[PDB]
Ligand binder design. Sequence first.
Ligand SMILES: O=S(=O)(O)CCN1CCN(CCS(=O)(=O)O)CC1
Ligand SMILES: O=S(=O)(O)CCN1CCN(CCS(=O)(=O)O)CC1
Ligand SMILES: [Cl-]
Ligand SMILES: [Cl-]
Ligand SMILES: [Cl-]
Ligand SMILES: [Cl-]
Lengths: 364, 364
Amino acid sequence: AMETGLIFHPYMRPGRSARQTFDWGIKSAVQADSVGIDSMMISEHASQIWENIPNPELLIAAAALQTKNIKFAPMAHLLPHQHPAKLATMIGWLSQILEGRYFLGIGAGAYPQASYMHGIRNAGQTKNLNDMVRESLFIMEKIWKREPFFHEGKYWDAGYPEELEDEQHKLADFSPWGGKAPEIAVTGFSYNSPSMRLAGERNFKPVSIFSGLDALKRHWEVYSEAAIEAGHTPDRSRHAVSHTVFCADTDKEAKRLVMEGPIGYCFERYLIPIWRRFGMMDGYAKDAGIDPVDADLEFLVDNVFLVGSPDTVTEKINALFEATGGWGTLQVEAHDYYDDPAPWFQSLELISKEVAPKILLPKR
Amino acid sequence: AMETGLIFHPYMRPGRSARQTFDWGIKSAVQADSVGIDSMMISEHASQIWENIPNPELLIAAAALQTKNIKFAPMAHLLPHQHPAKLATMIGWLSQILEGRYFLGIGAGAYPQASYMHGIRNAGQSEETKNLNDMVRESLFIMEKIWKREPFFHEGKYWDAGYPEELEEQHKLADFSPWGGKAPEIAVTGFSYNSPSMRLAGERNFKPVSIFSGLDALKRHWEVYSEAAIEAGHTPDRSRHAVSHTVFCADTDKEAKRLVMEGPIGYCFERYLIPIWRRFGMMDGYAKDAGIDPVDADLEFLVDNVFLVGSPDTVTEKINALFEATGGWGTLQVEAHDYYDDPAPWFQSLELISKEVAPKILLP
Ligand SMILES: O=S(=O)(O)CCN1CCN(CCS(=O)(=O)O)CC1
Ligand SMILES: O=S(=O)(O)CCN1CCN(CCS(=O)(=O)O)CC1
Ligand SMILES: [Cl-]
Ligand SMILES: [Cl-]
Ligand SMILES: [Cl-]
Ligand SMILES: [Cl-]
């Protein structure tokens, strides 16, 4: 029932080249596809070192004809940063190339440095990024329908022309596969996530970043309530939840490999300090009954990360399902194993083939 | 030596899918690279049937790690259609992925239907309206500054954009400057006799790409270009000049001609290109050169008098003759046609052009 997914930020070690990063992305897509992973989400960042993909569509396109079954999604295209017509056209064309193995993450962008680059001062505090998202979506949906219009917006002018006065002289068809909008997704983190409400209101796919039991429950509560009120039927099998996940033959090996390898390195060098600064471990702290100040690597490995043998990880997931109601896709956060992929590819294969099929049905 | 290049519009037969088009592009890039073709230019169109690539960068990215030596160029990114920061970031990143096997065509866009989609009414005409050429100049201004990674903010007529100061190695800004930290080489195409693009190109030391329309225009392009270059203080270099031609080589003149007349090339010309060329007076240069009335310029006339078609010796002679008449050029940019269903004769032609013809061409 539960699918396995990859989310590729990618947390490349500072100093990796663009070609190395791109090669690791393609290799990751091909391997994930080969072990039955259902989706690969690729994030977008123009200002960050570790999250060093500014154009997830380039990777998706390079992996498209090298894979069979896996579905790709930008997670997310930052709508305030591009002309909606240009973006809508690219999405539809890529969706066509993939024969529908595609869905669309949309976002405002959480990094003011990148907002600034794209002409939006004071994104942290004028232009409103959320209004820009709404206007872009309004324009893109119309372009995908291939119904003519011209729109003079607050943020952009855009349109879709009427045919001029042989099939070869009609307008190109860059509508997404099947001629309909792709499925749209949005991520959420905070406890009362406005993204989850938007998602529910518009029947988008919710993607939650695991921050603790209370938030995971609250996300679904907010989502479904918004869905119901908007007249949609909430479907928990749509819900994707992003986790650190690592599987090996034993609990001991699993833990050692995380502690001493790429995952532990990224967390100690980069993620733990950010998470500390921004209070992103308060949910985990609450769940385990500790002070956030004492949330270190080994705490996360023992209490938060889905780490261990296939049986252990299966248990941990099933325990979360009983506590929170569950989810449709386990979205595994990718790490920089480009130097020595074997233990990481073995983990993914275990998660996908041995863990995921044994998970309980999610709460309706 | 004169180099061989490919220019991929493409001219896909109406009815080809996006996946087929994309597959043909990758196959074409791989094959061109394998036979020593120096560059592959890929054009950008959102409204056209035959020219059905709206995002050349997706193709370039998919071919990047599958090729060794060939250089790629969008020909051209239509600068009025996207946010210059987003575009500048993607160009730098792709340039990095390609390790500098990349140059940048820029353009305004010659299809009003597509201009309309991107919020530009009355692109065909010379509140107040939008000027595509001014939009090109503002985009380039912004992109060059972003590539330099020096902070600024610009509130333009068409866009707001900037480059931020560092916040008060992993926490510094990402570096998506192009390969070597400098702007890519910039190219523009020209067609008309007194091409304003050729003047711009000369003024700014861009690479000129001429679309072959006759002896007089080819000479006039270089005259305009070099005069502008010299006045701007640049040294005009003919080896930079790319000239776009229909080119087809086979073992004999008879085979070459039959394959063009009866195959994909002839089909595209009779069904699509000849009527357009007739309507817009694009055969007047060829007519003048051969001493005929444009009304009588049909397929076989183009094959016998204009297209570089024949045996390797014959095509070598035709090129050498053009070199004596006009002064020559640095790259023979072969216009690609839809041989996706029959690649053998077309790949054979490109191999002949690249290995047997081009090395025998006299100095420009
Ligand atoms: O670097 S800056 O200080 O400019 C912005 C840093 N900020 C930290 C918090 N994360 C939340 C990710 S999410 O899990 O809430 O989606 C967004 C980025
Ligand atoms: O389709 S529309 O009728 O709306 C515009 C027609 N127009 C005809 C001429 N071509 C040649 C490009 S070039 O050869 O001059 O570079 C550009 C498009
Ligand atoms: Cl992020
Ligand atoms: Cl529904
Ligand atoms: Cl064109
Ligand atoms: Cl010079």
